[PDB]
């Protein structure tokens, strides 16, 4: 199955209220495995998954230094972006940075990406071919130019096609137990009502890995993505995920309603109705 | 393993 490693970085200006916040996290698939909090007392890159714990001091000392050198840059970049957009220092703004590599089931490189965003909006993005840049506005053009002068795209291409996948492959076989599993969902359905006009049919899918899952209702083949109360796939906390999809249905018409579950751990896509 | 640089905006 496909696997991917992603690094997420957030910095927000807190004017007159101490240092800018800076949070970094590392995921493999949907499993976090490292963190660095600028406010944390340790000032260290720390492990957040059992299989990353065996990495030696080399690793923690080295990453620790890189992530600090990151925060130092982002502290400045907040200043720089206020200048591009001519903004006062009284407000709080948000820099976001995500990069990572996607590999297929043969653990071969598929896709690299590395994207920035200011105040929730897409700011600048590395392309699919890992050479050009997408720069949204005036301000990002000023960043793009500096990143062509400083041959940044080429630095990233070498990381994504090289060291990124090289270490995703490490993390996978080290956390083979965790990352290469597919726990399939335990599925049940609840029927509950308050009035007589209608009852609500809810379709559950619990403790399953990875988070990718599809839940859809129907009235004999027709997509009932209508009264389709659908909650975001959420974490259980034990490394698995949860999701349910609900419909409210006129009484006594639970026969025609069925819920389709589709997941990587299910041989046949699993169907169920109320009993 | 991180990308070692944070390039300046």
């Amino acid at each position, epitope marked *: 199955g496909s696997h991917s490693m992603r690094y997420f970085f957030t910095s927000v200006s807190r004017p007159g209220r101490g240092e800018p916040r800076f949070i970094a996290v590392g995921y493999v698939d949907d499993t976090q495995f490292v963190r660095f909090d600028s406010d944390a007392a340790s000032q260290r890159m720390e492990p957040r998954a059992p299989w990353i714990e065996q*990495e*030696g*001091p*080399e*690793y923690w000392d*080295g990453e620790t*230094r*890189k992530v600090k*050198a990151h925060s130092q840059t982002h502290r400045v970049d907040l200043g720089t972006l206020r200048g591009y957009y001519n903004q006062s220092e009284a407000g709080s703004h948000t820099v976001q940075r995500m990069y990572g590599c996607d590999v297929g089931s043969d*653990w*071969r*490189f598929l896709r690299g990406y590395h994207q920035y965003a200011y105040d929730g909006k897409d700011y600048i993005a590395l392309k699919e071919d890992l050479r050009s840049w997408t720069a949204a506005d005036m301000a990002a053009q000023t960043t793009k130019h500096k990143w062509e002068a400083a041959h940044v795209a080429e*630095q990233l291409r*070498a*990381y994504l*096609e*090289g*060291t990124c*996948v*090289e*270490w995703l*492959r*490490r993390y996978l076989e080290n956390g083979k137990e965790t990352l290469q599993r597919t726990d399939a969902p335990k599925t049940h359905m609840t029927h509950h009502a308050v009035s007589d006009h209608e009852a609500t049919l809810r379709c559950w899918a619990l403790s399953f890995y990875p988070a990718e899952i599809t839940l859809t209702w129907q009235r004999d083949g027709e997509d009932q993505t209508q009264d389709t109360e659908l909650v975001e796939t959420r974490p259980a906390g034990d490394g698995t995920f949860q999701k349910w999809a609900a419909v409210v249905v006129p009484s006594g018409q639970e026969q025609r309603y069925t819920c389709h579950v589709q997941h990587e751990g299910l041989p046949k896509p699993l169907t169920l109705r109320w009993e | *393993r991180m990308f*070692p*640089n944070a390039p300046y905006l």
Partner: antibody, heavy 121, light 110 residues
């Protein structure tokens, strides 16, 4: 007793092509990269490039990108350092060495014995 | 290279000599250092790995460290057999490649 055995010494004319070899043994060949180090006569060590034989991905130092090609053969546990056009200044000793990562471990735990290359009109 | 080693080091049998190895934030700064020994006429050997560890076949008189952008190899109690070229080497982030220092030729003055 993991080991790296390199091809025999070579003397060549400029413009000829040449592919020296580095065969491994005593370890899982695909789990480790092979790199490739130059030592000009009288001078010190320079990293040339590497190949990850597991996935055939292969990189080079900027000095050597485009002057050589570094491939491998998973089955025969062989890595290669290859020229198309030799210079007179390619005359040097060429070591191969087995390394596992670019990190962070890192380090060239076993080295080959060295292949001497001579180039002269 | 952007990592620098003094070409010469000297000591009488039994003395201690450090060998400085001086780089930058991108090589020795954020990545690990390893040391290799080359008795002339031979391929080089892994001497210190992970900044400061010793392979099985290396005696404890050799010892390495690493602070900031500088790493030092310490040979504590020299012997005849120790006169060789000594090379530090760190991955450089700007080059996506390793860089060796120019080497340090060590002499024993018997």
């Amino acid at each position: 007793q993991m080991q790296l055995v390199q091809s025999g010494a070579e003397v060549k004319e400029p413009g000829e092509s040449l592919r020296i070899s580095c065969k491994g043994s005593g370890y899982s060949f695909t789990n480790f990269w092979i790199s490739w180090v130059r030592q000009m006569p009288g001078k010190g060590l320079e990293w040339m490039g590497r190949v990850d034989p597991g996935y055939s991905y292969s990189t080079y130092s900027p000095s050597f990108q485009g002057h050589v090609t570094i491939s491998a053969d998973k089955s025969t546990s062989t890595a290669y350092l290859q020229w198309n056009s030799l210079k007179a200044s390619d005359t040097a000793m060429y070591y191969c060495a087995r390394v596992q990562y670019s990190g962070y471990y890192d380090w060239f735990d076993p080295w080959g014995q060295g292949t001497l290359v001579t180039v002269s009109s | 290279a952007v990592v620098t080693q003094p070409p010469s080091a000297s000591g009488t049998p039994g003395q201690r000599v450090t060998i400085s190895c001086s780089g930058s934030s991108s090589n020795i700064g954020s990545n690990t250092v390893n040391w290799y020994q080359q008795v002339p006429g031979t391929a080089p050997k892994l001497l210190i790995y992970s900044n400061n560890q010793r392979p099985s076949g290396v005696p404890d008189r050799f010892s390495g460290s690493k602070s900031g952008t500088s790493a030092s190899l310490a040979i504590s109690g020299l012997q005849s057999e120790d006169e060789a070229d000594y090379y530090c080497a760190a991955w450089d982030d700007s080059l996506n490649g390793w860089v060796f220092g120019g080497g340090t030729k060590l002499t024993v003055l018997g």
